[PDB]
Amino acid sequence: IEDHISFLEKFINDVNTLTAKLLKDLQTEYGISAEQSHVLNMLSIEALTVGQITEKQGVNKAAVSRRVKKLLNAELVKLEKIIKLSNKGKKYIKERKAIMSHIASDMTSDFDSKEIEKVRQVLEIIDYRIQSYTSKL
Amino acid sequence: RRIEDHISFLEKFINDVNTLTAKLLKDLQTEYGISAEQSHVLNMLSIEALTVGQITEKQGVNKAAVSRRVKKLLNAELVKLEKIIKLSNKGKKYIKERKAIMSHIASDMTSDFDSKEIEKVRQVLEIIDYRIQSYTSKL
Numbered sequence: 312i313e314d315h316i317s318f319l320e321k322f323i324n325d326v327n328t329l330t331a332k333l334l335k336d337l338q339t340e341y342g343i344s345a346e347q348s349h350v351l352n353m354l355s356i357e358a359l360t361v362g363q364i365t366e367k368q369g370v371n372k373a374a375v376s377r378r379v380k381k382l383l384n385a386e387l388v389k390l391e392k393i394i395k396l397s398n399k400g401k402k403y404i405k406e407r408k409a410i411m412s413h414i415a416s417d418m419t420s421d422f423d424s425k426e427i428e429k430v431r432q433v434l435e436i437i438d439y440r441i442q443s444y445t446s447k448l
Numbered sequence: 449r450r451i452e453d454h455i456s457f458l459e460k461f462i463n464d465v466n467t468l469t470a471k472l473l474k475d476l477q478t479e480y481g482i483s484a485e486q487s488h489v490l491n492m493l494s495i496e497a498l499t500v501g502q503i504t505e506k507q508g509v510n511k512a513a514v515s516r517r518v519k520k521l522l523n524a525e526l527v528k529l530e531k532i533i534k535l536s537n538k539g540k541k542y543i544k545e546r547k548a549i550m551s552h553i554a555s556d557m558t559s560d561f562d563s564k565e566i567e568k569v570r571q572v573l574e575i576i577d578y579r580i581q582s583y584t585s586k587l
């Protein structure tokens with residue numbers, strides 16, 4: 312009712328903590344920070360402007376500016392305006408999938424693939440609506 | 449390869465949840481004169497009390513990039529040290545207003561679902577959260 316909201320928050324806080332730790336080394340091997348990493352996973356999904364990234368995150372523009380220019384200098388991202396993933400950046404996102412997929416299956420090897428289907432359909436509709444309300448405001 | 453698709457969506461889904469909250473709490477954060485990251489701190493202290501390390505490694509961010517956020521809130525009088533770190537009154541009102549916003553939207557975004565549907569959804573996310581936590585413990 313309202314603790315679904317709390318749960319959701321606690322669930323998201325947990326996933327972030329698991330991801331930070333599991334991707335700890337990779338990020339070090341790349342010289343990329345956690346701050347930057349999220350931008351890379353965020354761009355895996357879309358080609359965004361530093362503003363788009365800044366609003367889709369609520370943090371200080373300067374901070375997003377600093378991290379994007381670091382990703383360019385690292386050739387982990389590139390230009391059109393558009394800030395999209397470069398191929399070296401893409402391999403990180405693939406080295407990231409591989410590690411996520413490995414632990415994810417571990418924890419879901421016993422689920423009913425169909426139970427999950429209905430659960431996913433519910434989330435796609437909520438997601439669909441989340442994107443809808445979000446446009447500006 | 450089947451899980452990869454679910455993982456992508458989960459990441460997208462969480463991606464949007466974060467995005468939405470950011471747009472939805474901006475004006476309230478501005479009203480209280482705080483940054484979003486400063487809000488997370490208050491939010492993380494709404495569920496239970498914490499110290500610096502606890503938080504600094506909870507979402508593993510920089511060294512002196514947690515400390516600064518911490519003392520700022522003491523000065524804003526939204527948090528209290530009674531290291532130790534817990535929420536204050538003006539901070540409790542913040543979370544109040546915050547939850548009110550998150551509950552209207554989430555409700556009216558869920559209200560047409562069959563409670564049984566929502567409950568099933570949560571039961572699945574609860575078991576994943578459960579398995580996540582235990583994994584974290586093993587590092």
Ligand SMILES: COc1cccc(OC)c1C(=O)N[C@@H]1C(=O)N2[C@@H]1SC(C)(C)[C@@H]2C(=O)O
Nearest residue numbers: 342344373374375376377378379380381510
């Ligand atoms: C637009 O952002 C900036 C503007 C002006 C000066 C800046 O630092 C000199 C930066 C910046 O991003 N500094 C980053 C920081 O912190 N850094 C990096 S560079 C570093 C000093 C080697 C150290 C690290 O990465 O190890």
Ligand SMILES: COc1cccc(OC)c1C(=O)N[C@@H]1C(=O)N2[C@@H]1SC(C)(C)[C@@H]2C(=O)O
Nearest residue numbers: 327466469470473484485486487488489491
């Ligand atoms: C999980 O949020 C993040 C995830 C990953 C990196 C992040 O940047 C450090 C943040 C973040 O700072 N988020 C902002 C913050 O703090 N937040 C907002 S969204 C919120 C979590 C509901 C809470 C609030 O405003 O109530």
